[PDB]
Enzyme design. Structure first.
Site, short mmCIF file in Angstrom:
data_model
loop_
_atom_site.label_atom_id
_atom_site.label_comp_id
_atom_site.label_asym_id
_atom_site.label_seq_id
_atom_site.Cartn_x
_atom_site.Cartn_y
_atom_site.Cartn_z
N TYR A 243 -11.10 12.34 0.22
CA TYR A 243 -10.94 11.72 -1.25
C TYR A 243 -12.09 12.12 -2.27
O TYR A 243 -12.98 12.09 -2.13
CB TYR A 243 -10.68 10.21 -1.26
CG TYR A 243 -9.97 9.43 -0.71
CD1 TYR A 243 -10.11 9.26 0.69
CD2 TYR A 243 -8.94 8.96 -1.30
CE1 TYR A 243 -9.19 8.45 1.54
CE2 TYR A 243 -7.78 8.13 -0.70
CZ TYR A 243 -8.01 7.85 0.81
OH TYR A 243 -7.16 7.07 1.32
N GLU B 116 -10.23 12.79 6.84
CA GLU B 116 -9.51 12.49 6.02
C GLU B 116 -10.60 12.28 4.67
O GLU B 116 -11.55 11.88 4.74
CB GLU B 116 -8.90 11.00 6.09
CG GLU B 116 -8.03 10.43 5.01
CD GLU B 116 -7.50 8.99 5.22
OE1 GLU B 116 -8.15 8.13 5.59
OE2 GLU B 116 -6.26 8.74 4.92
N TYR C 261 -6.57 14.32 -2.67
CA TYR C 261 -6.89 13.65 -1.11
C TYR C 261 -6.10 14.72 -0.15
O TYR C 261 -5.30 15.46 -0.60
CB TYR C 261 -5.78 12.48 -1.45
CG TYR C 261 -5.37 11.79 -0.10
CD1 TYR C 261 -6.45 11.09 0.53
CD2 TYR C 261 -4.16 12.00 0.56
CE1 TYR C 261 -6.11 10.36 2.00
CE2 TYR C 261 -3.69 11.47 1.68
CZ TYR C 261 -4.63 10.68 2.35
OH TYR C 261 -4.44 9.91 3.67
N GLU D 290 -2.79 6.32 -5.37
CA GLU D 290 -2.54 5.50 -4.12
C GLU D 290 -2.64 4.01 -4.81
O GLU D 290 -3.55 3.53 -5.92
CB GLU D 290 -3.59 5.54 -3.21
CG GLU D 290 -3.55 4.48 -2.21
CD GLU D 290 -4.83 5.05 -0.80
OE1 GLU D 290 -5.10 6.14 -0.84
OE2 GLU D 290 -5.06 4.05 -0.11
N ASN E 244 0.92 -1.04 0.08
CA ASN E 244 0.05 0.18 0.03
C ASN E 244 0.86 1.32 0.00
O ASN E 244 1.98 1.34 0.77
CB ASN E 244 -0.86 -0.04 1.40
CG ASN E 244 -1.82 1.27 1.14
OD1 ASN E 244 -2.28 1.62 2.24
ND2 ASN E 244 -2.40 1.45 0.08
#
Length: 190
Positions: A88, A86, A77, A177, A44
């Site tokens: 997106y 957080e 992001y 990502e 990741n």
């Protein structure tokens, strides 16, 4: 230049590059607001360029090539503090829709496409302030693209009308990502 995970400013833009240590990812800071990511059987990771701090009405432009080979996302992001959020604004993705299992709050039309709005809660997960519990807001674009302009205000206003109260904006970047996949990308932010 190709660098190890870290953050800072490069050619006028804030950058942030992080990976889980699995290996198989190569991040390179390019000229202006450009960055390149090439990965193969990665873990990741998140990498991209933008601003620190971001704003609530920034119009972000991005152009380039995004070629995921599996699970990956391309999006605006960032983070907020007080409340800790957080977020997106997903423009394109690979084989997995990141909103899978999230709670749909509504829809919003912005920059040539309708976006589906979702929210999820991450409990005791790492954040810009350490291990904390926060909400994760999503705006997933129906018509995928790798070049365009994103009017962040449209999303923040839509999220606010749904119960989100963004506080102090921390970093705001256009990021790629990847999640245990392969691919390549060269994005230029402005």
């Amino acid at each position: 230049q190709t660098i190890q995970p870290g953050t800072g400013y490069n050619n006028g833009y804030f950058y942030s590059y992080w990976n889980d240590g699995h290996g198989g990812v190569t991040y390179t800071n390019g000229p202006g607001g450009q960055f390149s990511v090439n990965w193969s059987n990665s873990g990741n990771f998140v990498g991209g360029k933008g601003w620190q701090p971001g704003t609530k009405n920034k119009v972000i432009n991005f152009s380039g090539s995004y070629n995921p080979n599996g699970n990956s996302y391309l999006s605006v992001y960032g983070w907020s503090r007080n409340p800790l959020i957080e977020y997106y604004i997903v423009e394109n993705f690979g084989t997995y829709n990141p909103s899978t299992g999230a709670t749909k709050l509504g829809e919003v039309t912005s920059d040539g496409s309708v976006y589906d709005i979702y929210r999820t809660q991450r409990v005791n997960q790492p954040s810009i302030i350490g291990t904390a519990t926060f909400y994760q807001y999503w705006s997933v674009r129906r018509n995928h693209r790798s070049s365009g302009s994103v009017n962040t205000a449209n999303h923040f206003n839509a999220w606010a009308q749904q119960g989100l109260t963004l506080g102090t904006m921390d970093y705001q970047i256009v990021a790629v990502e990847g999640y245990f996949s392969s691919g390549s990308a060269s994005i230029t932010v402005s």
